[PDB]
DNA sequence: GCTTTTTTTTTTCACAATCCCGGTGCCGAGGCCGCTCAATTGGTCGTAGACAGCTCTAGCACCGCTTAAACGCACGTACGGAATC
């Protein structure tokens, strides 16, 4: 083998895979398709975060809470997508708090 | 009946004048009302969201300004 | 000797007049009630700063005027002088407002 | 020790997301509930694209998702098409769509 | 007799073919030379990642394909089937790309 | 050299076909080269700007992805 | 009424192109591995925002008057769209 480790490069791909095997267990994903799924996750991270950042800033608050994320989500996603995304985020917070 | 009809044919004619239009089909006046309602729908939805997020029952000018910026239609002169 | 202007002549006077002015061209009250009417569909018992409804109007009027300019070109492009619903529809299609 | 992901019943990395928020200049401070909420939203959206992108593959008689499959899935859904209206999916191509007036009689 | 398709029939075939496919339709090298040529105006002796040129191409063709959709709608709107420079120009004027 | 001619007629016709175009004026091809060039100049100028700010002598795909995002023309799949 | 003439309409009939199939063979999806680095756990301090309790702003209800704008309608010109070339 050869010396010097290539420098770390973060991605979401192991989590895209994991979600992929829930939804379509007998289905894989190409190299460039994963590059797209990455570019997607990063896009929506940025959009949501930015809007929450602004919401917090408008109402004179230092802290982004799950509340901000929800409001941003309601502003950014279309109708049905927002509902489900609001449900799942709520579920996730509810579940996380009670498992402390 | 509908407040949408309160946006009258003569007001519509004035708007299209300012936009340099000389001659106007009869059908436009409804068509315009459609567009305008969808415009307000979209802008007001996001403004009220900012209001509901601020825990207020009163929509400020700033609420609209942030809503209009999000919709790509930045607005000057109202506390920007 | 009853005087008559030809079709288009007063329209042309109106254009010239309205382009020169800056005053809002929708009656303010019917507008305010329309804003209040639509606002109900998201939240009931909502109050509006007067400046908020004025922003909304200033906004609504600029966008529509602008859309008329784009619509007008679509009509002219099809060798017409009369704007029609399909002109508005092409315009908003190209602007990326509708699919 | 078990991850914040497992507490929240998620696949997406709640810990990573929380750090990205702290390190991305969005606010001075970050609530504990935020990264949980966000991670979940990104996972949902991801799941919704992968469900639809899988279907386009299966319908192409293919096992692995490709860029086309994503594109088809996205543009054929009114909501996703809106969400990603100003986004270009490389090696996606376009939906087959010939205007009716151009067709023979 | 030697067989011949009527004007319009292969044009439609070509559409169906290219809309089905996802491959880039500009020849990669002439494009790359063009990218290097334009890039000189801003800074000389510039290198390019290969992926940067592919990114630039993916983006150019998606822009232009898209622009041709809007253009084709503008020609149709004037009851034409043939795209012309004025169609592209109007499309771009509406998009806001050009004054 | 003089590479814009390398965007050939047939390659322009191919793009137009993917864009659903059936019939194409003779004047379209030079007109399209103009647009394509204008498009590239703008995207590349910002890319190069990013490259220069990073003190590099080699344009990255990120430089181009970041430039494209700046033109409201987001691109997925090149590290975006 | 019916024969003749004529375009439609409609069917045969070649031929190009695009679609499926299996067969082949190659290369990156996929998963395993071992290490590293960032996440977690479990400490402490500090304050940011939730909360109550108050002020008093400006947002709403309502009335009565004065026009000015909105509304119909009678009338005809100039546009749109159809057709032919
Ligand atoms: Ca305080």
From Swiss-Prot, chain A:
The modification Dimethylated arginine is found at residue 54. The modification N6,N6-dimethyllysine is found at residue 32. The modification N6,N6,N6-trimethyllysine is found at residue 60. The modification N6-methyllysine is found at residues 21, 83. It is found in: Nucleus; Chromosome. The modification N6-(beta-hydroxybutyryl)lysine is found at residues 9, 60, 91, 95. The modification N6-glutaryllysine is found at residues 9, 18, 21, 83, 91, 95. GO terms for cellular component: CENP-A containing nucleosome; cytosol; extracellular space; nucleoplasm; nucleosome; nucleus. GO terms for biological process: antibacterial humoral response; antimicrobial humoral immune response mediated by antimicrobial peptide; chromatin organization; defense response to Gram-negative bacterium; defense response to Gram-positive bacterium; innate immune response in mucosa; killing of cells of another organism; negative regulation of tumor necrosis factor-mediated signaling pathway. The keyword tRNA-binding does not apply. Keywords: Acetylation, ADP-ribosylation, Antibiotic, Antimicrobial, Chromosome, DNA-binding, Glycoprotein, Hydroxylation, Isopeptide bond, Methylation, Nucleosome core, Nucleus, Phosphoprotein, Ubl conjugation. The modification N6-crotonyllysine is found at residue 9. The modification Phosphoserine is found at residue 11. The modification PolyADP-ribosyl glutamic acid is found at residue 10. The modification N6-methylated lysine is found at residue 91. The modification N6-(2-hydroxyisobutyryl)lysine is found at residues 9, 18, 21, 32, 60, 83, 91, 95. It comes from the Eukaryota. Its main location: nucleus. The modification N6-lactoyllysine is found at residues 18, 60, 83, 91, 95. The modification Omega-N-methylarginine is found at residues 61, 67. The nucleosome is a histone octamer containing two molecules each of H2A, H2B, H3 and H4 assembled in one H3-H4 heterotetramer and two H2A-H2B heterodimers. The octamer wraps approximately 147 bp of DNA. Heterodimer H2BC11 and H2AZ1 interacts with VPS72 (via N-terminal domain). Belongs to the histone H2B family. This is Histone H2B type 1-J. It comes from Homo sapiens (Human). The gene is H2BC11. The chain holds residues 27 to 126 of 126 of the full protein.
Swiss-Prot record, chains B, F:
It comes from the Eukaryota. The keyword Acetylation applies. The modification Phosphoserine is found at residue 25. There is a cross-link at residue 69 (Glycyl lysine isopeptide (Lys-Gly) (interchain with G-Cter in ubiquitin)). One of its GO terms (cellular component) is nucleus. Changing residue 10 to A: In TEBIVANED1. Changing residue 72 to R: Found in a patient with a neurodevelopmental disorder; uncertain significance. Changing residue 23 to C: In TEBIVANED3. It is found in: Nucleus; Chromosome. The modification N6-succinyllysine is found at residues 9, 55, 57, 69. The modification N6-lactoyllysine is found at residues 9, 55, 69. Acetylated as part of spermatogenesis progression prior to histone-to-protamine exchange. Demethylation is performed by JMJD6. The modification N6-butyryllysine is found at residues 9, 22, 55, 57, 69. GO terms for molecular function: DNA binding; protein heterodimerization activity; RNA binding; structural constituent of chromatin. The modification N6-(beta-hydroxybutyryl)lysine is found at residues 9, 55, 69. The modification Phosphothreonine is found at residue 58. The nucleosome is a histone octamer containing two molecules each of H2A, H2B, H3 and H4 assembled in one H3-H4 heterotetramer and two H2A-H2B heterodimers. The octamer wraps approximately 147 bp of DNA. Found in a co-chaperone complex with DNJC9, MCM2 and histone H3.3-H4 dimers. Within the complex, interacts with DNJC9 (via C-terminus); the interaction is direct. Interacts with NASP; NASP is a histone chaperone that stabilizes and maintains a soluble pool of Histone H3-H4 dimers. This is Histone H4. It comes from Homo sapiens (Human). The gene is H4C1.
Curated annotation (Swiss-Prot), chains C, E:
It comes from Homo sapiens. This is Histone H3.1. GO terms for cellular component: extracellular exosome; extracellular region; membrane; nucleoplasm; nucleosome; nucleus; protein-containing complex. The modification N6-glutaryllysine is found at residues 20, 43, 79, 86. The modification Phosphotyrosine is found at residue 5. It is found in: Nucleus; Chromosome. It comes from the Eukaryota. The modification N6-acetyllysine is found at residues 20, 43, 79, 86. The chain holds residues 38 to 136 of 136 of the full protein. The lineage of its organism: Eukaryota, Metazoa, Chordata, Craniata, Vertebrata.
Curated annotation (Swiss-Prot), chain D:
Belongs to the histone H2A family. The modification N6-(2-hydroxyisobutyryl)lysine is found at residues 23, 61-62, 82, 105. This is Histone H2A type 1-B/E. The keyword Metal-binding does not apply. The modification N6-succinyllysine is found at residue 82. One of its GO terms (biological process) is protein localization to CENP-A containing chromatin. The chain holds residues 15 to 119 of 130 of the full protein. There is a cross-link at residue 2 (Glycyl lysine isopeptide (Lys-Gly) (interchain with G-Cter in ubiquitin)). The modification N6-(beta-hydroxybutyryl)lysine is found at residues 23, 82, 105. Keywords: Acetylation, Chromosome, Citrullination, DNA-binding, Hydroxylation, Isopeptide bond, Methylation, Nucleosome core, Nucleus, Phosphoprotein, Ubl conjugation. It is involved in the initiation of both imprinted and random X inactivation. Ubiquitinated H2A is enriched in inactive X chromosome chromatin. Ubiquitination of H2A functions downstream of methylation of 'Lys-27' of histone H3 (H3K27me). H2AK119Ub by RNF2/RING2 can also be induced by ultraviolet and may be involved in DNA repair. The modification N6-crotonyllysine is found at residues 23, 105. GO terms for molecular function: DNA binding; protein heterodimerization activity; structural constituent of chromatin.
């Amino acid at each position: 083998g050869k010396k010097r480790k290539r420098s770390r490069k973060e991605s979401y791909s192991i989590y895209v895979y994991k979600v992929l095997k829930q939804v379509h267990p007998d289905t894989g994903i190409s190299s460039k398709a994963m590059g797209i799924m990455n570019s997607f996750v990063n896009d929506i991270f940025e959009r949501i975060a930015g809007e929450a950042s602004r919401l917090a800033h408008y109402n004179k608050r230092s802290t982004i809470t799950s509340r901000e994320i929800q409001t941003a989500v309601r502003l950014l996603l279309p109708g049905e997508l927002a509902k489900h995304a609001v449900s799942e985020g709520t579920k996730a917070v509810t579940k996380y708090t009670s498992a402390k | 009946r509908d407040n949408i009809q309160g946006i009258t044919k003569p007001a519509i004619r004035r708007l299209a004048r300012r936009g340099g239009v000389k001659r106007i089909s009869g059908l436009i006046y409804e068509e315009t009302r459609g567009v305008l309602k969808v415009f307000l729908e979209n802008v007001i939805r996001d403004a009220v969201t900012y209001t509901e997020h601020a825990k207020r029952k009163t929509v400020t000018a700033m609420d609209v300004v942030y809503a209009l910026k999000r919709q790509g239609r930045t607005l000057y002169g109202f506390g920007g | 000797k009853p005087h008559r202007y030809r079709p288009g002549t007063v329209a042309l006077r109106e254009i010239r007049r309205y382009q020169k002015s800056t005053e809002l061209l929708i009656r303010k009250l019917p507008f305010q009630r329309l804003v209040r009417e639509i606002a109900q569909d998201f939240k009931t018992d909502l109050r509006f700063q007067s400046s908020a409804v004025m922003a909304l109007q200033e906004a609504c009027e600029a966008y529509l005027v602008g859309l008329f300019e784009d619509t007008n070109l679509c009509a002219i492009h099809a060798k017409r002088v009369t704007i029609m619903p399909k002109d508005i529809q092409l315009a908003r299609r190209i602007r990326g407002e509708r699919a | 020790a078990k991850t914040r992901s497992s507490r929240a019943g998620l696949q997406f990395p709640v810990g990573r997301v929380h750090r990205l928020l702290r390190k991305g200049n969005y606010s001075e401070r970050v609530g504990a509930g935020a990264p949980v909420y966000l991670a979940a939203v990104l996972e949902y959206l991801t799941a919704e694209i992968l469900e639809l992108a899988g279907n386009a593959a299966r319908d192409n008689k293919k096992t692995r998702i490709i860029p086309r499959h994503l594109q088809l899935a996205i543009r054929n859904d009114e909501e996703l098409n809106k969400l990603l209206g100003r986004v270009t999916i490389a090696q996606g191509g376009v939906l087959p769509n010939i205007q009716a007036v151009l067709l023979p009689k």
